[PDB]
């Protein structure tokens, strides 16, 4: 994919930029288009040919492209701009469109709040079934976007992970949970386990030993 | 009145097949390249396939190569996607989108149609304890149930302060959810679809 920051934020009236980093075969060789997706709705065209706006798109949205990177700037942030933004470019090597991973833009309506992370080991009851699930709970964060990374004996995990979409809490901040699924034999083969939660420019890592 | 409308979405078993359709209105359908783009629940957009004005040039994402076939009927103002050997990872909202000639931008999108790939049958949850010093956090892992929802409470609703009941994840073809309480502590789980209730005492 094209690499985008998971989250971008600002207070109303501020100027916020969203980066989109690709490679020579896509952004390096072709124009970038941007799509805005409001929650639960279909995407819409926001920017085309790097910096052109279709009718209906306000001039506070602007695009640029340089080398293998593209950028979307939103000036004078308005509450209705809160949405997911995706960049996209044709890839000459794959003969395919490549989309960015998306950026949720939050228009700050409360101060930022870092996540509270708790890591739970598998229970002996579950281990009896030959499965092991570690649970990483994440609460009280705002904006409502986190990235979760897991490690086993210091090595990054690439499989057996699932993370919930963040949902609103009683207090109007966000919560999410992440799961690491292993076999009971894999759990017994390793010692150190960690869940790392990235929120804005703040990373929190919780660890345990089997 | 330039619109696109997808249809044919629904539930299909793994290994099964489904054909989506997209009806075009208010424009000369034969003058445009057309695309399918999909989005798995809570995930990013993933381009699927594209077809030229006269079907001379057809492209597929590597993830769907040899399983999906794009076609069009210019007289019937319709775009199609034939999806074979469907897998759980193909579950998504599928959108059809019109591509502009000069700019390659997808300027008009349909509302989307949901395709769910699952052979899951009604299954009760297994309930396991979550236990690890300034404040003690205990919980319940409600694993492998289908369909949603489950209801979770603590001490029959009497313990409400400090509780967080999280949304579910699809883990394989079944749901998993967790609930925790920051504080003789019982989690009460109800899964109406399987007519099951579980009360589990959690101890550190």
Domain ranges of chain B: 1-119, 120-202
CA angle A8, A12, A14 (to 5 degrees): 65
DSSP-derived pairing of the beta strands B33-39 and B45-51: antiparallel
DSSP-derived pairing of the beta strands A83-91 and A96-99: antiparallel
Looking at the DSSP bridge assignments, the partners of residue B146 are B123
Dist. CA A36–CA B45, nearest whole Å: 11
Cα A68 off chain centre by: 21
Looking at the DSSP bridge assignments, the partners of residue A13 are none
**φ, ψ (nearest 5 deg) of residue A105:** -95, 120
Looking at the DSSP bridge assignments, the partners of residue A47 are A34
Does B157 contact A at CB distance below 8 Å? Answer: no
Task: Please answer yes or no on whether B178 and A48 come within 8 Å at the CB atom.
Answer: no
Domain positions in chain A are 1-109, 110-210
- Residues of chain A positioned with their CB less than 8 A from the CB of B137: 118, 137
Handedness of CA A92, A94, A96, A101 (dihedral sign): negative
For chains A and B, count residue pairs whose Cβ atoms are closer than 8 Å: 125
Dist. CA A165–CA B166, nearest whole Å: 10
| Strand runs labelled E in chain B | 3-7, 10-12, 18-25, 33-39, 45-51, 58-60, 68-73, 78-83, 92-99, 106-109, 113-117, 126-130, 137-145, 151-154, 163-165, 169-171, 174-182, 185-191, 196-202
Which residues touch B92 (CB under 8 Å, ≥6 apart)? B38, B39, B40, B41, B43, B46, B114, B115
**φ, ψ (nearest 5 deg) of residue A143:** -60, 165
Residue B30 backbone zone (phi > 0: left; psi -120 to 50: alpha; other: beta): alpha
Cβ-contact A7, A114 below 8 angstroms: no
Dist. CA A163–CA A179, nearest whole Å: 6
Q: What distance in Å separates residue B192's CA from the closest CA in chain A? A: 22
CA angle A108, A113, A119 (to 5 degrees): 140
Report DSSP state, residue B26.
S
Nearest to B146 by CA among B72, B196, B202, B74: B196
Cβ-contact B47, B14 below 8 angstroms: no
Dist. CA B48–CA B80, nearest whole Å: 12
| Burial environment of residue B118 by CB neighbours within 10 A (0 to 12, 13 to 18, 19 or more) | middle
Cα B24 off chain centre by: 25
Dist. CA A122–CA B132, nearest whole Å: 10
Which residue intervals of chain B are DSSP H helices?
A: none
Residues in chain A, total: 210
Cβ-contact B140, B152 below 8 angstroms: yes
Does B66 contact A at CB distance below 8 Å? Answer: no
| Strand runs labelled E in B28-123 | 33-39, 45-51, 58-60, 68-73, 78-83, 92-99, 106-109, 113-117
Virtual CA dihedral for B114, B118, B123, B125, nearest 10 degrees?
A: -70
The residue written with tokens 């929802």 in the block is B149
Dist. CA A160–CA B169, nearest whole Å: 12
Tokens for B94?
Answer: 């599928």
Cα B56 off chain centre by: 32
Cβ-contact A53, A45 below 8 angstroms: no
Nearest to B172 by CA among A164, A181, A121, A126: A181
Report DSSP state, residue B162.
T
For the residues of A78-133, what is the DSSP string, one character each?
-GGG-EEEEEEEEETTTTEEEEB--EEEEE-SS--BPPEEEEEPPPHHHHTTTEEE
- Residues of chain A positioned with their CB less than 8 A from the CB of B130: 120, 123, 135
- Structure obtained using: X-ray
**φ, ψ (nearest 5 deg) of residue A15:** -110, 125
Helix (H) or strand (E) holding A188: helix A184-189
Looking at the DSSP bridge assignments, the partners of residue A18 are A72
Dist. CA A46–CA B55, nearest whole Å: 27
Cβ-contact B97, B106 below 8 angstroms: yes
Report DSSP state, residue A59.
T
DSSP-derived pairing of the beta strands A33-37 and A44-47: antiparallel
What is the maximum span of chain B, computed from C-alpha positions, in angstroms? Answer: 71
- Residues of chain A positioned with their CB less than 8 A from the CB of B103: 31, 33, 48-49, 52
Report DSSP state, residue B39.
E
- Alpha carbon separation from B86 to A150, A158, B9, B20, B64 (Å, rounded): 29, 23, 13, 13, 9
Tokens for A64?
Answer: 């640029």
Task: Report helix, strand or coil for B194.
Answer: helix
Looking at the domain that runs over B120-202, which CATH code has it been given? 2.60.40.10
Which residues touch B122 (CB under 8 Å, ≥6 apart)? B146, B147, B193, B194
Dist. CA B181–CA B130, nearest whole Å: 10
Q: What distance in Å separates residue A147's CA from the closest CA in chain B? A: 12
- Alpha carbon separation from B158 to B131, B140, B153, B162, B186 (Å, rounded): 20, 16, 8, 12, 10
Nearest to B144 by CA among B164, B130, B127: B127
Residues in chain B, total: 204
Does B107 contact A at CB distance below 8 Å? Answer: yes
End-to-end, the C-alpha distance of chain A in Å comes to: 35
């Amino acid at each position: 994919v094209l690499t985008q920051p998971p989250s971008a934020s600002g207070t109303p009236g501020q100027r916020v930029t969203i980066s989109c980093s690709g490679s020579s075969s896509n952004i390096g060789s072709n124009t970038v288009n941007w799509y805005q997706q409001l929650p639960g709705t279909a995407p819409k065209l926001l920017i085309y040919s790097n910096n052109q706006r279709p009718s209906g798109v306000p001039d506070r949205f602007s695009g640029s492209k340089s080398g293998t990177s593209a950028s979307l700037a939103i000036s004078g942030l308005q509450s209705e701009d809160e949405a997911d933004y995706y960049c996209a470019a044709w890839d000459d090597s794959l003969n395919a469109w490549v989309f960015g991973g998306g950026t949720k833009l939050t228009v700050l309506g409360q101060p930022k709040s870092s996540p509270s992370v708790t890591l739970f080991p598998p229970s002996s009851e579950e281990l009896e079934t030959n499965k092991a699930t570690l649970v990483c709970t994440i609460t009280d964060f705002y904006p409502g976007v986190v990235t979760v990374d897991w490690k086993v004996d210091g090595t990054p995990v690439t499989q057996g992970m699932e993370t919930t979409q963040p949902s609103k809490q009683s207090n109007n901040k966000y919560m999410a949970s992440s799961y690491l699924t292993l076999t009971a034999r894999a759990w017994e083969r390793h010692s150190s386990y960690s869940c790392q939660v990235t929120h804005e420019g703040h990373t929190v890592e919780k660890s345990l030993s089997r | 009145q330039v619109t696109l409308k997808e249809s044919g979405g629904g539930l299909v078993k793994p290994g099964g097949s489904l054909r989506l359709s997209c009806a075009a209105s208010g424009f000369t359908f034969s003058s445009y390249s057309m695309n399918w783009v999909r989005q798995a629940p809570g995930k990013g957009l993933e381009w699927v396939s594209s077809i030229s004005s006269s079907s001379s040039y057809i492209y597929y994402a590597d993830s769907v190569k040899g399983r999906f076939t794009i076609s069009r009927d210019n007289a019937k103002n319709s775009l199609y996607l034939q999806m074979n050997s469907l897998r759980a990872e193909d579950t998504a909202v599928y959108y059809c989108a019109r591509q502009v000639g000069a700019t390659w931008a997808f300027d008009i999108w349909g509302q989307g149609t949901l395709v769910t790939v699952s052979a899951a049958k009604t299954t009760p949850p297994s309930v396991y304890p979550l236990a690890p010093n300034s404040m003690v956090t205990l919980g319940c892992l409600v694993k492998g149930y289908f369909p949603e929802p489950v209801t979770v409470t603590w001490n029959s609703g009497s313990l409400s302060s400090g509780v967080h009941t999280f949304p579910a994840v699809l883990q394989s073809d079944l749901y998993t959810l967790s609930s925790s309480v920051t504080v003789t502590v019982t989690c009460n789980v109800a899964h109406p679809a399987s007519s099951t209730k579980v009360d589990k005492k959690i101890v550190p």
